[PDB]
C-alpha cells in the first residue's frame, strides 16, 4: 500500500535468490520512480534472461510492494503475449484493444502498472503501438503516462548472459563479481546492437525508451535447493534435506561443467510428489 | 431427503480419481516391459492433478520412444490420455504432428489452437499430441498458451505429448534424466539452426528454452510391446 525502500529491499533480499544484479537495479529504479511525485517519463524496465530464474517472480514482488493485491490489484495489468496475442495475423485486433485498454486505465489511474510477459514472442507491430506511451511526452492524446510503469519480461539474450556466468565460473571468480558492463559487452552483438537501439529509440530526444535492462542469470544447484526449501514450507511439509538434494538433481549444462539447470527452477517442484504424499 | 449408502460400499469421494487409478493400473498389463518409474511417476503426477480442487496448471506429460517403439508410443499415449477421463465416455482430443514439418507455421498454429480450445471448451479434459518433434517449429509457441505454470488457458486438463526419437532403439535401463536429455537434444536440433536469435514469430534457442520449461515436467521412455508393433493398437 505504501512503498518503502526498506520493505522492498527486505522482500528482495529475503526471497529472490541468485540474482544479485537484478536485485540492485530493481531496488533503485522502482524506489526512485515511485518516490518521485513529478517523473518526466514512465519507468520502463526490460527484465531478460534465463527461463525459470525469477522474472515473473520479481514482477510480483514489485507489484505487491506498490499495491495491495499485487498482480491482483485493480491497478496492475498483465498481458501475456503467448496467451493474449497468439496469432501474428490478428495484430490489428490486438492493437486496437490494447490502445483502448492502456488509455482508459491510465485515464482512471495515473500510477497504473503494465506488465508485458513473453515480449520476445510479441509482434513487433504491437510493440510499435505502445511506444508513444513509453516516451518523454508530457501528453499522449491528452493523457499523461509519466507516472505509469511498464515492465517487459523476456528470454532475449539468455544464452549470451549465460556465456558470461560460465566464463566467470570457469575463471574461479565469484558469481557476484559479474557486473552489468560484462553483460552489456556480451550483448553488444544482439540485444544491444544498433538495429535494436534503433528500434527502442525515443521519437522525441536522444534516449532509449527502456530505462533499465535488468539481466537474469542461470541458476546453480545451490539456488535450486534454496527454492525447494521455500516450497516445502509453503506446502506444510517437514523439510527433509535428503529430499532437497535429490529433487535439486535436475538436468544441468554444459556437459562438462554441469553447473546451471536447464530450466532454472521450473519443473522442479513437480518432483516433490515423488517423495511426499 | 438424502440417501446414504452403507460405509461398507466405499463410495468414492472423487469418482474421476478412483476410475483413473483403476484404469491406469489395468494399463500396465496391456503394456508389459516398461520402466517401473513410468508407471510410478505417471500415476503420482496425474493423481495429484485429478485430486486438486483448484489446479493451478494443467498436467503435461511427454512420452518418447525410439523408432522400434513407434506403434507402442502412439497406443500408450492415447490410452493414458483416455484414462484421465476413465469415469466418462469423454475421449481425448487427438492431434498429430506427423508430416507437418513443412506446412505453413501460422496455419498449423491456428489449427492446434482451435482444436485444443474447442475441445476443452466443450467438455473434453485431455489431449494427445503425437509427434511433437514434427510440427513446424514456430507453431509450437502455441504450447506456451496451454502449458504455462500460472496462466494456462485451461488449468484442469491433461496434455499428453509424444516425441519419436531418431535412433532405432532406446536402452531398457535408460533413466529419467538421460531420457529427458535425449528429448531435449532432439527438439533443439529440430527447432533451431544456431543459437542466434530470430524474430518474434519464429523459434530460436532462447524461445525454445521457455517452451521446454513448460512441457518437460515428466519425460517417460517407452519400449516396444511386440504385439502392438505387429498388430497395431487393437484395444
Amino acid at each position, epitope marked *: 500500500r505504501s512503498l518503502s525502500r526498506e520493505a522492498l529491499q527486505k522482500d528482495l533480499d529475503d526471497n529472490l535468490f541468485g540474482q544479485h544484479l537484478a536485485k540492485k537495479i530493481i531496488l533503485n529504479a522502482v524506489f526512485g520512480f515511485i518516490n518521485n511525485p513529478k517523473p518526466k517519463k514512465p519507468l520502463t524496465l526490460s527484465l531478460h534472461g534465463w527461463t525459470g530464474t525469477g522474472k515473473n517472480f520479481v514482477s510480483k514482488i514489485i507489484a505487491e510492494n506498490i499495491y495491495e493485491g499485487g498482480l491482483n490489484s485493480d491497478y496492475v495489468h498483465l498481458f501475456v503475449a503467448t*496467451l*493474449h496475442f497468439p*496469432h501474428a*495475423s*490478428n495484430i*490489428t*485486433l490486438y492493437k486496437d484493444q490494447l490502445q483502448l485498454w492502456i488509455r482508459g486505465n491510465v485515464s482512471a489511474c495515473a500510477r497504473s502498472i503494465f506488465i508485458f510477459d513473453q515480449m520476445d514472442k510479441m509482434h513487433a507491430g504491437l510493440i510499435d503501438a505502445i511506444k508513444p506511451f513509453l516516451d518523454y511526452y508530457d501528453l499522449v492524446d491528452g493523457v499523461s503516462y509519466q507516472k505509469a510503469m511498464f515492465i517487459f519480461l523476456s528470454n532475449a539474450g539468455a544464452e549470451r548472459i549465460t556465456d558470461v556466468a560460465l566464463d566467470f565460473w570457469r575463471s574461479g571468480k565469484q558469481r557476484e563479481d559479474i557486473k552489468l558492463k560484462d553483460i552489456e559487452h556480451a550483448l553488444s552483438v544482439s540485444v544491444f546492437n544498433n538495429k535494436n537501439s534503433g528500434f527502442w529509440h525515443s521519437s522525441l530526444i536522444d534516449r532509449n525508451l527502456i530505462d533499465y535492462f535488468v539481466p537474469f542469470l542461470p541458476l546453480e544447484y545451490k539456488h535450486l535447493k534454496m527454492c525447494i526449501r521455500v516450497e516445502m514450507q509453503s506446502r506444510g511439509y517437514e523439510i527433509d534435506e535428503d529430499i532437497v538434494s535429490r529433487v535439486a538433481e535436475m538436468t544441468f549444462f554444459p556437459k562438462e561443467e554441469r553447473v546451471f539447470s536447464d530450466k532454472g527452477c521450473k519443473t522442479v517442484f513437480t518432483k516433490l510428489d515423488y517423495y511426499y504424499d | 431427503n438424502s440417501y446414504y449408502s452403507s460405509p461398507a460400499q466405499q463410495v468414492p469421494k472423487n469418482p474421476a480419481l478412483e476410475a483413473f487409478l483403476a484404469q491406469f493400473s489395468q494399463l500396465e498389463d496391456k503394456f508389459p516391459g516398461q520402466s517401473s518409474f513410468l508407471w510410478q511417476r505417471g500415476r503420482k503426477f496425474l493423481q495429484k492433478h485429478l485430486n486438486a480442487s483448484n489446479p493451478t496448471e494443467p498436467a503435461t506429460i511427454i512420452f518418447t520412444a525410439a523408432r522400434e517403439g513407434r506403434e507402442t508410443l502412439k497406443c500408450l499415449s492415447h490410452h493414458v490420455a483416455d484414462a484421465y477421463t476413465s469415469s466418462q465416455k469423454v475421449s481425448p482430443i487427438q492431434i498429430d504432428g506427423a508430416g507437418r514439418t513443412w506446412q505453413d507455421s501460422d*496455419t498449423v498454429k*491456428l489449427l492446434v489452437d482451435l482444436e485444443l480450445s474447442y475441445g476443452f471448451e466443450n467438455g473434453q479434459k485431455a489431449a494427445v499430441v503425437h509427434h511433437f518433434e514434427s510440427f513446424p517449429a514456430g507453431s509450437t509457441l502455441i504450447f506456451y498458451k496451454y502449458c504455462d505454470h500460472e496462466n494456462a488457458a485451461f488449468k484442469d486438463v491433461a496434455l499428453v505429448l509424444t516425441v519419436l526419437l531418431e535412433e532405432e532403439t532406446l536402452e531398457a535401463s535408460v533413466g529419467p534424466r538421460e531420457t529427458e536429455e535425449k528429448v531435449r537434444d532432439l527438439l533443439w536440433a529440430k527447432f533451431t539452426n544456431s543459437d542466434t536469435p530470430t524474430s518474434f514469430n519464429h523459434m530460436d534457442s532462447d524461445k525454445l528454452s521457455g517452451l521446454w520449461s513448460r512441457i518437460s515436467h515428466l519425460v517417460l521412455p517407452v519400449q516396444p510391446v511386440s504385439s502392438i508393433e505387429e498388430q497395431g493398437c487393437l484395444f
Partner: nanobody
Amino acid sequence: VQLVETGGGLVQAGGSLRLSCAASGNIFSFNVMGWYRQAPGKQRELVAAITSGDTTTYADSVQGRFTISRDNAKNAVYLQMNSLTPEDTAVYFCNARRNPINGPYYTTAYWGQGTQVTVSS
C-alpha cells in the same frame, strides 16, 4: 448480433457448393470465424477457420478442396466447397469467436442455426 447461414442443399459427388454467413453486427472484432459440420450420430468438427487478418486453416479431410474467406466490410464469411463426396454430408454451422486481451482466458462464441448439405453418390 446473429449469424445466419445460407447456401446448403443437395450436390452430386464431384460437384460444388458455396456456403455464406451473414452476421447482423460488425465482425471485425471476431478473432476467428469458421465453419463446423455435424454428421448423423457424430460430434461436431472443425472444417475451416480464418483470422481477422486472413490466415486460414483446414481440417486434414478438406485440404485442397475447400476455401474459407472473410469480408469484415460485408460482415460475411464464406466456404467454397469443391469436389464433394458423400462423406461431406452434414449440417454446417458458422462460428465466431471473440477473446479478451487481458485477464483469464475465455471465449465468447456465436453460432448460426446451421444449413444442411447432402452429397449424393
